[PDB]
Design a protein around this ligand. Sequence first.
Ligand code: STE
Ligand code: STE
Ligand code: GSH
Ligand code: GSH
Ligand code: K
Ligand code: K
Ligand code: K
Ligand code: K
Ligand code: K
Ligand code: K
Ligand code: K
Lengths: 244, 243, 49, 243, 48, 48, 48, 271, 271
Amino acid sequence: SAEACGYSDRVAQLTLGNSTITTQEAANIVVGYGRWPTSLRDTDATAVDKPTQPGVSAERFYTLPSVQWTNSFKGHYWKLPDALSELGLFGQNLQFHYLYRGGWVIHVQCNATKFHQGTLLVVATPEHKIQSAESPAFARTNPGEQGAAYQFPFTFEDGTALGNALIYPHQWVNLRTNNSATLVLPYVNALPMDSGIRHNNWTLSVIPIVPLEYAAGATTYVPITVTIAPMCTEYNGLRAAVTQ
Amino acid sequence: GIPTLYTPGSGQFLTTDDFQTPCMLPKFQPTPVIDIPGEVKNFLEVVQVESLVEINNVESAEGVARYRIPLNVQDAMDGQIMALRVDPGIDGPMQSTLLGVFTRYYAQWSGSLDFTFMFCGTFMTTGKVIIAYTPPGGDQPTNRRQAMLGTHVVWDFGLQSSITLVVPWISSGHFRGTTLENTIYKYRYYEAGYITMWYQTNMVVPPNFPTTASILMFVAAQPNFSLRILKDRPDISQEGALQ
Amino acid sequence: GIPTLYTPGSGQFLTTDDFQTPCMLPKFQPTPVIDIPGEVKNFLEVVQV
Amino acid sequence: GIPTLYTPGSGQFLTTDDFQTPCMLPKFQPTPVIDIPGEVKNFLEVVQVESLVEINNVESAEGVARYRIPLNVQDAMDGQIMALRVDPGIDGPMQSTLLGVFTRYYAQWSGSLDFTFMFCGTFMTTGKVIIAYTPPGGDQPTNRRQAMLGTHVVWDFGLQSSITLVVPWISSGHFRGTTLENTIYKYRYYEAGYITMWYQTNMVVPPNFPTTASILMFVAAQPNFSLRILKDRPDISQEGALQ
Amino acid sequence: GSNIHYTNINYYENAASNSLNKQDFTQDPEKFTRPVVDVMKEAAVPLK
Amino acid sequence: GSNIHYTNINYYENAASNSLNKQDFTQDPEKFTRPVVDVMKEAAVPLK
Amino acid sequence: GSNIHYTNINYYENAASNSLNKQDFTQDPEKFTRPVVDVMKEAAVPLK
Amino acid sequence: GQVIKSAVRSTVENTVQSTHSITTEATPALQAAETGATSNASDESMIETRNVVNTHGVAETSLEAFYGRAGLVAMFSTDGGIYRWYINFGEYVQLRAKLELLTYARFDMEFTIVAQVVNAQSKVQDFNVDYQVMFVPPGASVPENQDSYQWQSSCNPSVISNTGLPPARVSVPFMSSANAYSFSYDGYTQFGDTSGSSYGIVPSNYLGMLVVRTCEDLDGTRLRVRVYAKPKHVKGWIPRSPRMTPYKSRYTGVYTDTTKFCANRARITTA
Amino acid sequence: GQVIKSAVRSTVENTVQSTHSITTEATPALQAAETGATSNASDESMIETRNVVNTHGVAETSLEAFYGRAGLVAMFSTDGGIYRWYINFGEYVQLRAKLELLTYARFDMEFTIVAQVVNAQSKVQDFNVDYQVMFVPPGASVPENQDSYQWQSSCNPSVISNTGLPPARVSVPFMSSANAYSFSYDGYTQFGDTSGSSYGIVPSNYLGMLVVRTCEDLDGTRLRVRVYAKPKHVKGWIPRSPRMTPYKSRYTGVYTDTTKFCANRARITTA
Ligand SMILES: CCCCCCCCCCCCCCCCCC(=O)O
Ligand SMILES: CCCCCCCCCCCCCCCCCC(=O)O
Ligand SMILES: N[C@@H](CCC(=O)N[C@@H](CS)C(=O)NCC(=O)O)C(=O)O
Ligand SMILES: N[C@@H](CCC(=O)N[C@@H](CS)C(=O)NCC(=O)O)C(=O)O
Ligand SMILES: [K+]
Ligand SMILES: [K+]
Ligand SMILES: [K+]
Ligand SMILES: [K+]
Ligand SMILES: [K+]
Ligand SMILES: [K+]
Ligand SMILES: [K+]
């Protein structure tokens, strides 16, 4: 028994709405800042309209297009809620409302073989700015569901040290050990709610710190897949659909 | 009026002073404190979090590659893998870590240190390495035999990918200066010693496997660690007004 | 005299300050407050109109 | 604001003032006080410790030899051996002693004094000497007969190598000035008297033995001794910046 | 270190006028150092 | 916001010397917003 | 000499800010004047 | 939904004596950084330790102790007897880098103003003059001249002092419309605009400007002013990765890419 | 393992009346300095004494009373509007000699700064100017110029005052990494080096430096500064043999040999 012996079982199942995700090579589960997603308290709220709480229609797993771990791969990132702004009813609720609040369950996938070696840092960063350019391009600050490739991994695209990104909720996908990372994230902001089309609360980054190598002749095509589920969401300020 | 006698210090502006003063908006009522995850009350909470050491700080290593300790199949025994002074506040691999940055915001430190290492070779790649902490007195150990006489851990590569070598606080005084600057202050007095890594056996791999692999190095303060005397971080500077 | 140490801000005139000060007419006795309709205590009473 | 009226003295910097002031590091937490032997709380603890008097301060005596009172086999009786003003703070043999140094850090003193002497001749060398304290009023005694009329002790050389002559506090006033400077202050008023030593019998030795021997002289404050009014020690000075 | 006895009276109306807070403690860092769902005891292996 | 504890001693003879009042509440605005003789409940029509 | 009555309130947070200590006593000097193992009474001879 | 507790402590952890351990059961040294958790190997489990009643405090690293002191935020000279300073802490890097160590923070502030007269060659003068610092909130009219009507300051708070008096000083409350200031914002300043210049700045962090003047005209000289800010009653959330590159702009965190942080050494095997 | 007690006293010892003694038993006068013990012969045993209720106090010789007053530790003039002073008390001999009377000591300190403007010929000027004294701990960057960025002093403590105001003054705690300051150290500053210049100095006694500047440039004049230090809350251990030779160097106790301390007299028999 994992609880009795004091260890974490390498298998896991994540079930939300009509979706179930499984892995047989996990490395525990991270819960950002030790906090599970929670509803907005009456004492913290300011918007007075009764909120919409979509439930299972939006709180389920959405799988984004996979990314290849190429030989020159520097890493890839996705902004939240930006990446899911046009997916399913989560996207619709995000567009039709001025205000949105919610947490996340992130599952990053990358399997190879016992003949491959490589290590990916999987980190969820609050308020992660892509500020390496004098005038950041919208295509890079809000890359959508396809996400964007890293150009400056060592400086974390924001002028800080990549090695210190561990101060943010994270896990590693070290091929010899695991093939997936799972992170539960609570809503974080200096406000009770905010606009899902003007502000990205979190940024998911998958960065190779130890390059992908393997026994000569092994499969060279190794994808990285991201599956994300909104959790405990609520929306206020209903109107027509509006995207950034 | 009550007779008073004003004293030296009157009118001075000590940046660390702590007096009560009139408020610009005496009746102002701030927004409520809401529930936000991740509250931090003391930076000791931050330095206890592991971050990567920029250990391979050599000319041939650029960017991300500087975090990787090179390991390779040997054809000789007892060889060395790496070396580093354990002092958290001096220039070098430690300066860009979380622990290093905050230590550099202070003049003195104390406490045991957590150095954790994660092997990143293939599942089939094995090996045993010894990591040693050499308390001060002399120079870094010249060979494995000398190194193993100090505090150490023997690490076996396997399912549990990482190992921790605790560099226990072993010091004459309760605190050490964070710099070892010698020309002016002669602070080399405080050197905390060295951490070295050696092949215990060898890195071994199957046919046609990569004969080189990497180890990532993490460091953090232990629960008995503290810092004293705040000072400006030497890494932050400017030569003029900012655009 | 009681030893004191004056601090930064001394002598300054902050328009929103709130101290007690000597009165020009210490023994002056104002006219009584009479009953007048329409007393307002806070301007929120006005913006709600 | 509370009406106040500031007074004379305001803004002044009295070096001996004692006010509370803002701390540069308000939240600083010092290292713990550990157990260290030899704690001292008052310098009276130090002046009560015996130290050597530089008694033979003559041209022919250099360095260590200045601590030795010369004694020799006599061929005449009642002869003198040494003399000294007992004042602990004046220039002379007493100025370099522990008692003298601290007395020179003050303007006034009071208390009995402990003058102890240790004979250092051979085990076979005998002798009896008289040590006398002459309270003030006149000049130092001219001969043994005059000296013995004052406070004194007759010392017999033997197994117990030393003797103590207590110069009891005998003064008109409760305290005396530590200097006897006359030209300006006329402090000769305070002279405490003299201590003189004479042969009571003679120093006697066996055949071919050294006919000269030495006595070491120690001095310390007694338990009823105290000092008042701190002042800068005149022996410590400088003519410019130090290298 | 800090005095066990010292005056702490507020002379002004707004809390913003008050002197610095005098708590200065630290809290268990687990929310940052070990933000995991499953407990991994020190004496056991992390993964099984 | 305002301190729950703060000194409020008057040093002068006349009330005019005192510091500012520290109440600052508001009152129901009906004397300005609804100065009418007949009550017109929110759920009913105003006139009939 | 010293007053039997005087105010001693600390206005600052750190003890380093406090005025000078007001003890000033002395202690038996034996640890310096007679640091010996065997007691040698005043009325007896020192050595036998 | 907080599953991880945060008990408070006023001293670092003690060390308890430990003995040898030869077993297949307890393996404190074996770890797995992949989990995202920092090692939990204790000193007592890695070596034989002695008892150490450790009374070292933790006060100087508290948010209050770290931030609770004044730092320069503005420095300028009047021109035509006036100067308009937009309140922001990106001009001078020291305090800026400190604040960016936190994602969100609430705090009051103590502002201290040090001013003196200087001539055209920037030589300081021993000249006492009255000066006025007026806080103009966004939306209020900013004076164009040294003698414009806005200086009447009937509503805007103003502080009038003299270069011959001690530095002026006033406290300000936590003024943001938000529930905390943000020192990192991954979003835009407005809807309908995605230009780079509108990215990474949260407008609620800007509370207005300080306009300074001498009450009357100086003859050929100017007023030099330094503004210091000291955070008080700090509450902070979400520690951030420290700045590791030089700042280049006052309003953005733009930086120059680099291939290394610390300087190089000859070899990884020589400490 | 303390076998010798240390009872406290607030007054010197009384004198009790004594009478004659003619015996072979009690011999208070016989002593033996070889034992290392100071004589224990009392006044009452050497002569016939009277009763004296002695109320003389012992306060002025306590460590607090002896050390508890200000003494000069630094004196200098700015050059280019700046001066860097390494904190050490070996420059001015008076306070130095006092401290060396103890081997180890813990104490807080009150620093008082007196400054004024002087011209090129060292003539004092009646000129009020703002000056800044910044404490730069070891490892922190020391400003090279009067207007370098380090003066922002966001972390380093600084005190800004004016030559027209009373002397500046601040208290500092017992800051050593050791459990007491050492005023005598028979050892070296580092391992692997036995050069004479590294002997007799304990690095932990050096807490950094004070850098001083005028906030703005003086025109042809300079800032003269004197720094005084006053020990407070003194705790001391192991009294030392007092300095008996002139000091020659600021960092070492080197001295010139001598054949005598006090001056000579004609003969040992003439007081
Ligand atoms: C009349 C008295 C003048 C005193 C100055 C008052 C200043 C009021 C503004 C206070 C706002 C301070 C908080 C700003 C923090 C955000 C800074 C930034 O992100 O750049
Ligand atoms: C900003 C305020 C400036 C005030 C000065 C602060 C000075 C801080 C240093 C305190 C250390 C004093 C103890 C040194 C004793 C040892 C001296 C020596 O051995 O030479
Ligand atoms: N030399 C110019 C520029 C000086 C300047 O702006 N210095 C910056 C750093 S580049 C600073 O932070 N100065 C701090 C201070 O003077 O208080 C002047 O004095 O006007
Ligand atoms: N005359 C030179 C040197 C004076 C000097 O350094 N004096 C030393 C003693 S040699 C001192 O201690 N002065 C004490 C003081 O002036 O406060 C000057 O005034 O610059
Ligand atoms: K629902
Ligand atoms: K403890
Ligand atoms: K373990
Ligand atoms: K740890
Ligand atoms: K008595
Ligand atoms: K005896
Ligand atoms: K004695």
